[PDB]
A = this chain, B = another copy of it.
Amino acid sequence: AALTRDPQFQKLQQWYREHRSELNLRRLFDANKDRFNHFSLTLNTNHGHILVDYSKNLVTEDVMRMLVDLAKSRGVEAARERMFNGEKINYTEGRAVLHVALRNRSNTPILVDGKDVMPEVNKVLDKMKSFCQRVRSGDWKGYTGKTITDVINIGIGGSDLGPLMVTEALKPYSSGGPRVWYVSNIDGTHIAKTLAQLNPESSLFIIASKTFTTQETITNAETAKEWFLQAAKDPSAVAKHFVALSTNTTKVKEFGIDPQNMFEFWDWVGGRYSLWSAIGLSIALHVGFDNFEQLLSGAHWMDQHFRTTPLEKNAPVLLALLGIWYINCFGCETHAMLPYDQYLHRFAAYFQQGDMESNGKYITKSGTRVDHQTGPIVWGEPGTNGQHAFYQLIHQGTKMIPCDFLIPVQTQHPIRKGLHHKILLANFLAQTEALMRGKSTEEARKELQAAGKSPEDLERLLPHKVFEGNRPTNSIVFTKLTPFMLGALVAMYEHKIFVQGIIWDINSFDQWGVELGKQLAKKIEPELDGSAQVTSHDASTNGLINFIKQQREARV
């Protein structure tokens, strides 16, 4: 593959093999009291600062130099320009990749097929703004003359995870907005338990799907429309309670949605990069279009940072390169994202798609099979909860796990004169300090003796109380989790993912891996009808189906 043949990558791998056992964080910090200043970036967005402290990583100045040289050798800057200039860098599908245009507040022209896309981008934004003002003010009325109290987004994957994550993260900014609900699973309990809590007269359904053919979403949509029409009866009332977010006007029309109720986006908006488009309507209804615009503006700021900053001081580039170091030299399978913020509780789940569906790939641009690792498994839970669930393994298991710890300095809820947030910050700081420093046999022994342990209780317990440490982390600290700041943070990780894919020579913007499961499900669906045994598959699929048919009738 490209990367394995690259001379700067080989230089990196060789340095790693020779100097690996020289990378100990305790000794690195004891030896260089300027390590924080040299291995961190402080960004002023003018709407909050962002400190990206990457100094608790297993790197030296030489390692960072070699990584930046790898980015240059792999052509990261030229690929970036291709994206921003509207070239068809999604080469398997022959499409541009222009989520950056969706938030291009500067309205600099971006040409696709020789045509500036920004007028169309701004036309839809204007339509979203109008619609949100009317719904939130109460001017948009239901079929019995009532204001909308509940907005229900029906969509899955990229049509769900983004808006859900953002409305959870920005819940303090939703005063005066309708309640927002997210229905995504085809599993009928999802729509069933939602609809049981809603009044058809004051519920607005948003049907979100790029192609508008996804079975889960269309089936949920028909179930909601049947439920609505059982109450309203009048088919003309659907135009007051159903809108669609999509690129497929025909399928939206055939589903029965008023064409004036379609909020359009384009084929160069990837689903996992789509919350910035019409797909974000549920965000703008919930927290208002002004806050949605702030969210776009934060992403736009980080877009310009990525575009204008020399690589050695460029935040998404450095984050991407530290990942390459741990993925392709240290061999770490996973990457944990640990926001110390309850409002960010769906942030890790969002970048499970954003990261893993982008870079969970194995074919390069030349059609060649990679001979190296690509994207990691992303996971995580908010702090401090994770400390009492799985940090045991991070501290004392047998896995190397690069971790990003994130926290806002200022809380949305400064209760008890800031006591809760002070403890939260103390734990945020302590855990990365603990992961780095550990605790030696000698230090553990002195503690046990001071505690009063007998020589026999001490010797039995001692080895279990040792922390080997040397476990690397990023600490990402920002002034406050505002709409703007969330936009900048999400964009920062979007460009991290971009840079890694360019280095790996893969396509971060296609997803051919979802097709096989969809084909096979289409063939099994009809076979579940009737009680006849199935013999048309492998023995396991047959046996599972036939067990399902046996127990479908059992009375528990």
Contacts and interface: CB of A to CB of B under 8 A. Distances in A.
A420 B482 contact: no
Interface residues of A, number: 162
A548 B538 CA distance: 59
Interface in A459-479: 459-468, 475, 477, 479
A420 B360 contact: no
Given A216-B384, A420-B223, A540 B53 contact: yes
A188 B420 contact: yes
Nearest to A552: B409
B160 A362 contact: no
Nearest to A546: B36
A23 interface: no
A423 B352 contact: no
A394 B360 contact: yes
Contacts of A463: 363, 367-369
Contacts of A379: 377, 379
B189 A413 contact: yes
29 contacts: A29-B539, A36-B539, A55-B539, A92-B461, A171-B193, A188-B413, A189-B411, A216-B423, A219-B423, A333-B334, A333-B377, A334-B334, A334-B377, A356-B390, A357-B389, A359-B393, A362-B396, A362-B397, A362-B468, A392-B514, A422-B528, A422-B529, A426-B521, A430-B517, A430-B518, A433-B524, A433-B540, A436-B538, A464-B510
Interface in A70-118: 92
Contacts of A432: 540-541, 544
Contacts of A29: 538-540
A369, A393, A395 interface centre (most CB from chain B within 10 Å): A393
A517 B394 CA distance: 12
Contacts of A248: none
